[PDB]
């Protein structure tokens, strides 16, 4: 009976996105920003759309490797830009020194960093259906900490885990392919069907 609880249903941290960082000195930006979006991959997206309103805390983990993947003692900076705050415009730009944006410093050889983000909304809950005229959680930014640009190539894999999930007003599960993010469009011309087809209605097997 336990595995059917909403809370157990959204648990089990998984990959919410991947960004590739490269330090090329001038030619490459040398940093990366990743906006927080639950809906990037459609697995969880289909599950969040099952409910109108939700509330929860987020827990993130950053797995990072270098190309072929061998690790070396370089320092990294994961800064969190809360909603309604400017994002770093450059590798060395002054936003990295802004104290209101929390940062975590970790050597690349270390076990991955974990961070907990609380419920950020002004409303009482997140809503992925708003009929009228969203839900910005924040953004993460990564760079390498050095005076001189260290030529390096990175990819970070963001694993997110929800905590203390509460839902309201369930919805039906989408039967049509997703055309694009942030809108529930569907192809009108071709319409997939809920169940497959059989020979005759009078025959079961």
């Amino acid at each position: 009976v336990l595995e059917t609880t909403i809370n157990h249903f959204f648990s089990r941290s998984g990959l919410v996105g991947v960004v590739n960082l490269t330090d090329g000195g001038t030619d490459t930006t040398g940093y990366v920003t990743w906006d927080i979006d639950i809906m990037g991959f459609v697995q969880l997206r289909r599950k969040c759309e099952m409910f109108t309103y939700m509330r929860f805390n987020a827990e993130f983990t950053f797995v990072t490797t270098t190309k072929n993947g061998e690790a070396r003692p370089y320092m990294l900076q994961y800064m969190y830009v809360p909603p309604g705050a400017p994002k770093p415009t450059g590798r060395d730009a002054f936003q990295w020194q802004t104290a209101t944006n929390p940062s975590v410093f970790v050597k690349l050889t270390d076990p991955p960093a974990q961070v907990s983000v609380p419920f950020m909304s002004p409303a009482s809950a997140y809503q992925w259906f708003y009929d009228g005229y969203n839900n910005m959680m924040g953004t993460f930014a990564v760079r390498v900490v050095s005076r001189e640009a260290s030529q390096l190539k990175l990819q970070t894999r963001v694993y997110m885990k929800l905590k203390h999930v509460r839902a309201w007003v369930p919805r039906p599960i989408r039967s049509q392919p997703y055309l694009l993010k942030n809108f529930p469009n569907y192809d009108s011309s071709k319409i997939t069907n809920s169940a497959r087809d059989r020979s005759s209605i009078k025959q079961a097997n």
Partner: protein
């Protein structure tokens, strides 16, 4: 005959603690134009509070008053002879959102309402077979000609702007097409009635 569906099981109530709670002509029975339903039809939907944005004294109170709160009492009737056969699914969808098939009229149809293009998907891209997880009632001409649904105020914030945000919508979709032998009236009307409950401004 009293058979009533409380949405989610909660009576509309005034907000837990100054807003105005007018009832003289404010809370009373508003009846729309009737929809004439035919063999080839698709089915209809309405947006609230929108449908009342220009009506009576409520549309006036819907004007100004950038904060809005209320419930509703929805009654739906169908006048059909014993020789007509068919069924209607009457549902109430919070935050009902029409999508693109690839406009403000689709989002805000007004008093008349609008008709579906692809009802099977609800024009939300969602299977109609599952629409029954919503507060709903069947209108089946074989038994009942009328359905009544009570909707409390449902939102993630205690107050909102009635103009720019429609809280939910109402949907009548014929599941089984209207059928009649020749000579009977060829179009059956559907009447809609809205009674606000515990309105605040």
């Amino acid at each position: 005959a009293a058979n009533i569906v409380l949405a989610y099981g909660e009576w509309p109530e005034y907000c837990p603690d100054k807003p105005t709670r007018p009832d003289v002509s404010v809370n009373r029975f508003y009846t729309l134009d009737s929809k004439m339903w035919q063999e080839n039809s698709t089915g209809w939907y309405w947006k609230f509070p929108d449908v009342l944005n220009k009506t009576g004294v409520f549309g006036q109170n819907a004007q100004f008053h950038y904060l809005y709160r209320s419930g509703f009492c929805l009654h739906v009737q169908c006048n059909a002879s014993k020789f007509h056969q068919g069924a209607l699914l009457v549902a109430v969808i919070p935050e009902f959102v029409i999508a693109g098939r690839g406009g403000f009229t689709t989002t805000f149809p007004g008093t008349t309402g609008a008709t579906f293009h692809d009802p099977y998907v609800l024009d939300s891209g969602v299977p109609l077979s599952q629409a029954l997880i919503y507060p709903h009632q069947w209108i089946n001409l074989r038994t009942n000609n009328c359905a009544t649904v009570i909707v409390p105020y449902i939102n993630a914030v205690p107050f909102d702007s009635a103009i720019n945000h429609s809280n939910f919508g109402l949907i009548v979709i014929p599941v089984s097409p209207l059928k009649y032998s020749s000579g009977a009236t060829t179009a059956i009307p559907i009447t809609i009635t809205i009674a606000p409950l515990n309105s605040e401004f």
